Design a protein around this ligand. Sequence first.
Ligand code: HEC
Ligand code: HEC
Ligand code: HEC
Ligand SMILES: [Cu+2]
Ligand SMILES: [Cu+2]
Ligand SMILES: [Cu+2]
Ligand SMILES: [Cu+2]
Ligand SMILES: [Cu+2]
Ligand SMILES: [Cu+2]
Lengths: 455, 455, 455
Amino acid sequence: KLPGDFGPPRGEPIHAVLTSPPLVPPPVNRTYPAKVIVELEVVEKEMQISEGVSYTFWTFGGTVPGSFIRVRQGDTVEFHLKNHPSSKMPHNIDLHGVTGPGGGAASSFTAPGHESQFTFKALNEGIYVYHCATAPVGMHIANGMYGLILVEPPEGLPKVDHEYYVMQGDFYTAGKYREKGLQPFDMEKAIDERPSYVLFNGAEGALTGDKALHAKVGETVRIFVGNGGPNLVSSFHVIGAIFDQVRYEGGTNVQKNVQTTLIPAGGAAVVKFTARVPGSYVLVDHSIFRAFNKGAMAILKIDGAENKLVYSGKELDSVALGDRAAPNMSAVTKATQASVSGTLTVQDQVQAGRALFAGTCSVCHQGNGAGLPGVFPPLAKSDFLAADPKRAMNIVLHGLNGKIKVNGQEYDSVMPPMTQLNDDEVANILTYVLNSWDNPGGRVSAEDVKKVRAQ
Amino acid sequence: KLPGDFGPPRGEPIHAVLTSPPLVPPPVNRTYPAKVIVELEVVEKEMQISEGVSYTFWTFGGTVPGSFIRVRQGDTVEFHLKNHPSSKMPHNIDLHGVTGPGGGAASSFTAPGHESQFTFKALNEGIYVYHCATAPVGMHIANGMYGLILVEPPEGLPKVDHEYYVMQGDFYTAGKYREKGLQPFDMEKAIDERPSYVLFNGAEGALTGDKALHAKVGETVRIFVGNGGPNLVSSFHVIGAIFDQVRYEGGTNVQKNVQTTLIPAGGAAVVKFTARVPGSYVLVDHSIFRAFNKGAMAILKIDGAENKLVYSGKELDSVALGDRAAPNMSAVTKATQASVSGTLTVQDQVQAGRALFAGTCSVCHQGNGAGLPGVFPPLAKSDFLAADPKRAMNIVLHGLNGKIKVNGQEYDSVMPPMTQLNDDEVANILTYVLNSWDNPGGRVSAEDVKKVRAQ
Amino acid sequence: KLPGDFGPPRGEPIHAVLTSPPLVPPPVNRTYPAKVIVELEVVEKEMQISEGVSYTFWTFGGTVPGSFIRVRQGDTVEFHLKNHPSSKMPHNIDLHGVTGPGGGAASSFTAPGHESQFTFKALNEGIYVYHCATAPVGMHIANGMYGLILVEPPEGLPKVDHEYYVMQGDFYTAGKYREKGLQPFDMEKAIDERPSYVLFNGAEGALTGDKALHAKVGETVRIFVGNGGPNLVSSFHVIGAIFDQVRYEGGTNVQKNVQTTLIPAGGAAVVKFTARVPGSYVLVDHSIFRAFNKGAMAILKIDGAENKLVYSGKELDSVALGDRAAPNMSAVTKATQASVSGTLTVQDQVQAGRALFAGTCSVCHQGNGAGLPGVFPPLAKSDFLAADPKRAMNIVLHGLNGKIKVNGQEYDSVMPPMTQLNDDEVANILTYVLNSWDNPGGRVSAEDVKKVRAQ
Ligand code: HEC
Ligand code: HEC
Ligand code: HEC
Ligand SMILES: [Cu+2]
Ligand SMILES: [Cu+2]
Ligand SMILES: [Cu+2]
Ligand SMILES: [Cu+2]
Ligand SMILES: [Cu+2]
Ligand SMILES: [Cu+2]
């Protein structure tokens, strides 16, 4: 026998129902091998990789990651790849778990407006990455051409309350993190393995705030976790919880009771979580600058009764989650669009700066700008801020130390530089502060900050 | 007892037969512990790390990786290290799996023209990296000073049809990838972990094309897989197949049925593959820019009958394998040598450009230059190419977009920039295109391209 | 049941005794669940990250890594975090192994001079990283805010002879490796994952020479191994030995008989070592430029009888361990302090250069400067050195090749450049050589070298 030796296909041909992230198709719930027809279409399109930041993604099914495919070990899969006629590039597919050269690549080569097909038997149970394998392969994967296929064991997976679909990728923009506008792919950064963004499901905030995954206290969650790369290895981790089980691809080995697990580039794992106490559980790449400086954070939000005997503490806030504690940062998108249109108002800037102030400034100056007398000076009704708004731009870009006097009190501390903030971000944060807490109002422009940065 | 407590050496002293990659010594096939005498000589020498690219390697036994050593758990090993008198540097050896300080390092210190010896008992079964441990250690490992020793279990490994020897390394050249000439080691890139090449067995194409590993449908293959580093961790992966078994060093744990496995820097694994359908199975570091932009791809070629019930698709071609689909790129070596000699002919350039055109240009313009009317413009009998050969140099270096007219048809698409191509590569590709498909002939020089790149 | 369902706390409340690295609290040795009160204080302070190199660390309990916490699965932990009033920054804590949002983060937010508390039940047995989770999280972790908590299984761990505490971190200084002075945190290098130092226990040499860990032949050692990151994954390895067992966090899976093991960023493992033969066993990150160029090396020194049947070789020396073979490099600290004070003597420079010469120069020129006639020229009574001390500065910075004559003998070899040596290091090494072996004496200044480097 080969593995997956369950006989020829029986029953009727099945048209696979594919799902967009973060959702998963229902279990196949089948005791016989089937001919499964899969139809997947490549679409090239602009999407928001961050608020006010567009990127030309190349997608399987219009999403990053691509549509989720779910079949049964021993199935015969008739794979149809279409390339939308709006595409500029040819594309193909390499599915992990396929037995045969290129995992489908040579037979699935598809020009814009064409369709290709190949047939394979799913011999190998497991969770598997699929991706484009068109020269230059790294460019296609970097632009978002990856997803997951699940080959179920014949008896199916154990029932759980929720199944979700989460995939990490590293992304390479010409511009710096959160630099606004349409950002080209940067080949130099990709070859050097120096990503500008590291993301779950193709965007900053794709799985935070009002887009969090949900479950209730007492329920079981299974997450199909992919690492599309192209280049990075994920120190994949859940903050404040533990995985009951971690199983890689279709491996025989199952690790139980771990919190931190390494997912290779092109790798995939099935993780199981039991909800015990309510709150936000953060999925991160624990290579920490990825999670906290490049976007690599997703949320599983658990609702239900607190258990003070297990955990007496509060729900996560802007101290740890920064500007992603809030439901969304839609005001940044709106302020960026208004800048492009030449219609940016003070209130556009105030609402964008309000979103960006959380964590970034609030951890020390507080959400109300009061600070802590003698320790963190106030931004609320600040005489020092009002006396010199241009000095305030320098303070954000280049930091501040030494003795100062604010509202009649001496400070002798250190505010670190925040030079990685973009000109629009500094301008919008300071406009928010000037228009809050009885401050004098007016505005700071991106152009004002550009000139102070240039020194 | 210590582990490997099999008594004193018996029988006759055995002179170990060492093998060069990718071959392995035969199984020891022995029921008693032996005194094994190992003789390994360090040689410093220039070799081709890529076509027309030389590098001064430092080698154990004249190869990268070094000669394969095969002994039995419980053996007494008398290790002789010689340093060839042509060497400039002192060398030594640290074998993983040795019980004792430095794994041999202090007692194996060997100046040019000298010999050292130390004795160790092989207590620990497993596959193990050995490497040089001479200050500065990273420089010696970076220049190729690593290989594998297998310590067999007393009963031997299970029989297989083929055993092969494959070792990844990261390499640091002063010049960029495929920049021609003798390339010095670059300490700055090595300290930053920014390799110019990531290779299997010490060269681009060492295990591709006419140097592929072979087996037949139905046969079992065991690969001894090393990661010499110095710095990178391999997302080690087989395209289009699965590993029956993966076992790290002499670990008790064996993973079964996985496709993608992380091999630490200085780590080693034994993988087992069963051949099911014919074609090329690609071994890669799935940190994808390594595999597709820095050389990290090897081939296991399976011959035998197709099974359309398991896989209906075609053998891999230049779409996925690029310029390594072909048997070899010997024309690039020959054109580089002719440039050095000042004897470079048009035909030298044409044959080199023919090799480099595969994948790099052919994925969109086709192997015959016809393109796809209205989608990818033709290079065959191209009026647009002929009208301005200098514009063609700019197009390759800097890309092209917007409306153009080629052979009476409008195109409105995007050709990405290919600025990572070296001046000789652009010149040779364009000379190939000009001398093919009824194009006007003539030639483009490396110097022509240097001037266009300088703008 | 939840896991760790051992009933309510019994007995008396226990004030946890915490230990500084590399020591561990004694086993809890308890058959009942307890209320454990933990008190940990954040201190910001300058410490030596290398000889003559200061850094402002942020610490849990005044050390990097932070104080070790030891409790029993099923314990109720009342966690008190104090922030010393000298602190400039707010801090908090996220303990892996805590069941609840942020692992403690929202409830442990603590301004300078304040205290916070939260209670959690230790449901999950294992070894776990804890760290600060205050925006910007990567900055706090990069400055040293991490350590380990052990949650014992109810029956306790198996008895061993020694338990030690070793934690890797990556560090980001504005200055280059071993550049002297107070070094600021460098956000740009941290975001790029380009550390200047990779260290065990917060400093170069923290666990080498006279600070090595100890045990005797025949004894068992358990090491609690953390990777605080923030960014790097450790190819964690013991030179010249094997781990009996490696267990990650509280995972069910235990790997036995491995030498090289990958520890994720934010991960932790318990390793077990049996001492077989005497000597220094080096713990490294086998991403080799970290271990040999950035400080990532620690020593377990085994005393006892040699066993020539297992290993005939010598103890490690400066060939493999370089300048860390010696007990300490205190002369470098003293010479750096004397430079700051403007009191640097020739003898200050000689003793610092003596420390730095080991490995760096001695591997080729020998510890006595004799070299090897015709192969490595002498530094002892060197006519070539004496004839031009300025040429000697160029040779160290930029290397030397080609035919030379030294003390009546021709050399035709290659000395690699050592441009990564700092101006003070070149000046002190050459002053050592000039004042040794009947050389003419005098001195080379850091300023002399600065001018030669500037060309
Ligand atoms: C702690 C880590 C802080 C963060 C984050 C931010 N700021 Fe700050 N800021 C902080 C200190 C300790 C000080 C005083 C420094 C000293 O020399 O003692 C400051 C100072 C300012 C000021 C000027 C003083 C005042 O008006 O109160 C301004 C205008 C200011 N900070 C603004 C500001 C903004 C907008 C922030 C986010 C972008 C921000 N700060 C972050 C401590 C900390
Ligand atoms: C697809 C990803 C392509 C690859 C790889 C290469 N080329 Fe290309 N090329 C492509 C397009 C879509 C276009 C037209 C762009 C537009 O504005 O619509 C081009 C154009 C050229 C041209 C000029 C037009 C012509 O003569 O047909 C030349 C001379 C050319 N391309 C050459 C070329 C070479 C030599 C390549 C490898 C080095 C190469 N191209 C790659 C699409 C793609
Ligand atoms: C081997 C890897 C070496 C290391 C490490 C260092 N040196 Fe060296 N040095 C070496 C060689 C082979 C040569 C001769 C090169 C040639 O062209 O043949 C040298 C030369 C020098 C010299 C000049 C000659 C002499 O006086 O003997 C000096 C002053 C010198 N080397 C000093 C030196 C110092 C101070 C080192 C550590 C910083 C050092 N060398 C390292 C080989 C090697
Ligand atoms: Cu594609
Ligand atoms: Cu793949
Ligand atoms: Cu060597
Ligand atoms: Cu090693
Ligand atoms: Cu902190
Ligand atoms: Cu953490």
